[PDB]
Amino acid sequence: SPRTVEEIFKDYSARRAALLRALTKDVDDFYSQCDPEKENLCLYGHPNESWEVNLPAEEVPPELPEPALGINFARDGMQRKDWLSLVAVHSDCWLLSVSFYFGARLNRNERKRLFSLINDLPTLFDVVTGRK
Amino acid sequence: SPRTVEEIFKDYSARRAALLRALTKDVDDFYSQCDPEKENLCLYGHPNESWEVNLPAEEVPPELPEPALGINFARDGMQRKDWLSLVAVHSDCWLLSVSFYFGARLNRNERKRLFSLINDLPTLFDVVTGR
């Protein structure tokens, strides 16, 4: 598992790149996969820069923090831009959660450095909502 | 919901105090409530400083980020200090997720300010592992 600030931040950046693609370039594919009829689905970003919409893991408790569950259930009950904004916020939170799970052993100053690197990247919410 | 940096940190601090109490002063009560025989359980911290062991939220998807699911399923299969340490790290992550969920509309300078405040308190993992 990623252990140094450099390893954790490269893992973060890769997952984020996958989720950014899911919510922008591939948004039609992501939207179509989140069918409200299906069982509960979540949006995962992986450090190979792949994104997927999938069931959560069957065995619990999970190794890593898990993304928001059942985002497809909400898709048709709101404006598409608002559904995408909500997915984006929860995906920002998940990415931060994963990084600080790997970073549990970092000291206070290392945690501050890790966040500063993350905070220099625009959030998925800001990109999706058009904030700068 | 909390919106300003101070509002969000007040909420964070109270939820953290709840979770810290569950993992230290109230740990035997907390441990016993995490019954491997029940359905999957999570540990919540609330803004009134109370902690709660319960089933995951009824509403799907949840309004707030949710804590780790099923921690009672792992309680008996590892060292007690290790189970508590992993509950603590997942609980630390959950606190951070909740705060930056509320802080979604903060700008980049405001987000740095919030993290610096959160980073002024020791984490649950550091207290529980005695670091």
């Binding site: 065995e59 | 999957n40 792992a74």
Partner: peptide, 12 residues
């Protein structure tokens, strides 16, 4: 390392 000792199937 630090890992959960075991687990259970997600309730449903």
């Amino acid at each position: 390392i630090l890992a959960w000792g075991r687990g259970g199937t997600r309730s449903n």
